[PDB]
Amino acid sequence: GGKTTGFALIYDSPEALKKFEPRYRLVRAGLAAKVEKASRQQRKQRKNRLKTLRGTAKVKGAKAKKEK
Amino acid sequence: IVGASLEVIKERRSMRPEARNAARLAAIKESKEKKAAAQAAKKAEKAKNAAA
Amino acid sequence: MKLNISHPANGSQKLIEVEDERKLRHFYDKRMGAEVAGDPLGPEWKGYILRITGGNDKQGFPMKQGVIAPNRVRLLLSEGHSCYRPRRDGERKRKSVRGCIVGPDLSVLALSIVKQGEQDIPGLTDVVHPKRLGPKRATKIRRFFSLSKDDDVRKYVIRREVQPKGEGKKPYTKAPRIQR
Amino acid sequence: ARGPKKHQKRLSAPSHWLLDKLSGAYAPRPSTGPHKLRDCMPLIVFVRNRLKYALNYRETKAIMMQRLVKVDGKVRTDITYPAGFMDVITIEKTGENFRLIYDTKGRFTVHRITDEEAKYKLGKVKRVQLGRGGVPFLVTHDARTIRYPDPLIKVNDTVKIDLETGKITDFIKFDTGALAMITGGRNMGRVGVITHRERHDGGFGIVHLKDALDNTFATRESNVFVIGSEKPWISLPKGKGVKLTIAEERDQRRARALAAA
Amino acid sequence: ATELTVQSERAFLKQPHIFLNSKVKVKSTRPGKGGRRWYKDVGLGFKTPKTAIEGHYIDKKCPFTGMVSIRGRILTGRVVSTKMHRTIIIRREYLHYIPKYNRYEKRHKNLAAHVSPAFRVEEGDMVVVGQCRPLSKTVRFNVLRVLPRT
RNA sequence: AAACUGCGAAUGGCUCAUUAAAUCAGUUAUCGUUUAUUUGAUAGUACCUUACUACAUGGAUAACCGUGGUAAUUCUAGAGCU
RNA sequence: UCAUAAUAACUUCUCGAAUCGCACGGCCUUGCGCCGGCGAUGGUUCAUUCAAAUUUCUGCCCUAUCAACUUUCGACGGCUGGGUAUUGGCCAGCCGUGGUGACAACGGGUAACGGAGGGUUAGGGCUCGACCCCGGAGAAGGAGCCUGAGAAACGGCUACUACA
Ligand SMILES: [Mg+2]
Ligand SMILES: [Mg+2]
Ligand SMILES: [Mg+2]
Ligand SMILES: [Mg+2]
Ligand SMILES: [Mg+2]
Ligand SMILES: [Mg+2]
Ligand SMILES: [Mg+2]
Ligand SMILES: [Mg+2]
Ligand SMILES: [Mg+2]
Ligand SMILES: [Mg+2]
Ligand SMILES: [Mg+2]
């Protein structure tokens, strides 16, 4: 056929739009840019791998000098 | 303590008793005028109330 | 057999290497937490009395106070004990610990100075290490600086000057967060 | 089974919630509260599936976060809060009030009510006695407890609650000639007048009612909900809960359809 | 029932919370309130037997002068054994329906109940029993009334 | 950031080995018991302790600086602060 | 012998609030003076909700080349206690000798988790159901236990056996 049906949303203000619209549709419309992140498996491996470190896991090179 | 030094703590602990009272009086007095100035600001809003 | 000597008064610690056994004979058969004289250790230790605080075996197992044995024994360590850190509330895991009687088997002793002597140690008692922070409670500050009930303790508080990395602005001041 | 359950599987939810068998595997699982689990109206289901205000789950919990809508005059902050019979939900911003009440087919329906008279409720008492210190008290069907009641008020009656001060303004006795609505069983939505009551020693008595169309029916005492003696205090929905059979239901749908167009 | 004496055991049997040695003497109609023998009525149109009111027996399992209430289902049966001590066995018979063969067959079950010293029950008597709390491993019923024999 | 403390981790998911009045089904009961959480109501410390301060009590510990042991683990010792 | 009230006492014995943050007001003897509004983390008892454990009645395949079974060291019931969140032969003592069965007990087989239900049709039936819904049990095979309202838990611990 030659007819098409969809859904429409009309917002009162741009701030209410940006405050309520979902991220994936915002990326669809192009108003805001996408977030760059690593894969889910890499994130999961990092999170469970860092559970074996105790205190200030941001830098953990202090135990490299124990061997001399 | 690290922030101060031995001599510093020594004088601070050894400070004369009357000086403590003088410092307290000075602090209470300055607080008194600063509070009075806040009351003067309350008088300024009272003047705004009279204007309105 | 290594030695870890500590000075609580000056807040200083040092590690020494000892290879000659006849100097170390007099520590034997003593218990952890006992009193010993450091005179046989050397001329620089004359007039020194030391307290035995702990030690470690060559294999790495720690000593536990209250168990009398020269070998090591298995125990069911519960929560709140010394050499056990549970992974879950109420968890107990079976471990192996060495008795509290000193013997030739151990690798390192740790001990502290009880009474200062006439002579000085070249690298231990000549330095003092600043305490990182000061008291944080209102009662402690009041008793420490010897104030009275009403003296506006708020003004009297240690202040440390902190600065940013390289922004070029003036440093500011930080305070100990009185909680009472 | 090593404790109580915290999940409810879809395809096992009560039928009167009207949930589609497709589009997901789970159900809202309303949280614990003042109303029974079997016969309750979750707020998320009411707002999203009936009013169609929210498209899906994600914004449903965002909607409540502004505290715009309240029930019984008090704000509730859990999305799966069990609402029930006679409960009134008030939204000040739009300016209308709703009451959760059964229709003639046994499910919850939207029912507009006026703001001025939508500020009171009424509920049946479960037991009456004196509590600690000798103070009498009663508890209704919505977990409302009120101390120092009228001594004439007895069990199984119904009492009118102001909902702002919690004072006993008025009450209705449970006797013949009263107007009642059934709240449990298959006879959902009927309205009738109590004819007579006969009791059986040992529990589980039955009561006989009669509809406006000279119909006759019976139900348990635990399922009767008296709302007045005559001229019922609340506003009944369209149809007045008379349950015409399928013959007249089929006659009326074509009759109004042809009349309109 | 026939009991020679009430106190023929190691311990002393008495009703709990019933004060029996009072300095002041007061006469009251109430059973337990005044200090005399205590009894009540279970209900369901069941009348307290006369032997209970003036009897002296002590029983913690009797529905009368006891701490057991009668509540639940009420059953009927045929008595088959009454020759043990303070316990009876009843037999109940019914008919089961087999759908395929369109006819019935008879079946029966056996039940155990506690008998009070107020009643005297012999073989071939009609009885009515009522549910109660567990009194033993396999005793959950109490006799209430014995119908006259044919 | 880290860490102390609070809560959850007994929900979900998989399988049908054992089990023949055992499990289970429909129908009753708890006047024979326990119950996180949610919701609604609800507590004149009479004197102790004239007084201990009520305009408000008292000691540790984490994180942390720095020094170690074992080839080996989400193993740990002793020293100094809060 | 209920809810509740009253009297004479007791207790290694509880609770009756020394917690935390965002909004800025009123009086007068004008002193760091007094009073005063909404919310997080609690707390004694009652009511409610999610429940849980026990518990009344009836209903399960084939087999007699399975006809009597149960009480050594509880098997049926009575009494006095201990233990459990509570009843109860659940356990400890004393005293009676009981309980089920040809109306199929007891035992042996099951290539047996139970139910809602699937396949096949004049009607009556025969057969399947591990498996999307409800209930029960298990985490290689046995036992024991901490924390916690809730576990005899195994993505919790301890010990043995077999693998590793
Ligand atoms: Mg009843
Ligand atoms: Mg199988
Ligand atoms: Mg509460
Ligand atoms: Mg026989
Ligand atoms: Mg099997
Ligand atoms: Mg199945
Ligand atoms: Mg299942
Ligand atoms: Mg388990
Ligand atoms: Mg296990
Ligand atoms: Mg696993
Ligand atoms: Mg698990």
Chain C hits for B4, CB-CB cut-off 8 Å, are: 158
Structure tokens at E148: 């006259």
Minimum CA–CA partner of E72 in chain D: D202
d(CA A34, CA D109): 43
- Structural biology method used: cryo-EM
Taking the Cβ of residue E44 and every Cβ of chain D, the question of whether any pair is shorter than 8 Å is answered with: yes
Q: Entry resolution in angstroms?
A: 3.2
| Spacing of C87 CA from G139 C1' in Å | 23
HSE-up of D215 (CA within 13 Å, CB side)? 14
In chain C, which residue's Cα lies nearest the Cα of B4? C158
Q: D58 in contact with A at a CB cutoff of 8 Å?
A: yes
Q: How far is CA B45 from CA B34, B35, B50, in A?
A: 17, 15, 9
Taking the C-alpha atoms of residue D183 and residue D76, their distance in angstroms, rounded to an integer, is 25
Question: Per the structure block, which two tokens stand in for D208?
Answer: 């006989």
Q: Distance (Å) from the C-alpha of residue C111 to the closest C-alpha of chain B?
A: 26
Instruction: Say if C92 is an interface residue toward chain B (CB within 8 Å).
Output: no
Chain E residues in contact with D200 by the CB 8 A cut-off are none
Q: Is the CB of D222 under 7 A from strand G?
A: no
* Long-range contacts at D44-49 (CB < 8 A, ≥ 24 apart): D44/D79, D44/D80, D45/D17, D45/D19, D46/D83, D46/D89, D46/D100, D46/D108, D49/D18, D49/D19
Nearest nt by C1' to C107 Cα = F69
Looking up tokens 């309205």, which residue turns up? D191
User: Which of D62, D31, D67 is closest to D48 using CA atoms?
Assistant: D62
User: How many Å apart are CA E114 and CA D45, to the nearest integer?
Assistant: 55
Chain D residues within an 8 Å CB radius of E44: 201-202
What is the C-alpha separation between E124 and E77, in angstroms, rounded? 11
C-alpha to C-alpha distance for E55 and E51, rounded to whole angstroms: 6
D183-202 residues touching E, CB cutoff 8 A: 201-202
Residue D194 near residue D180 (C-beta atoms within 8 A): yes
Q: How far apart are CA D158 and CA D126, in angstroms?
A: 9
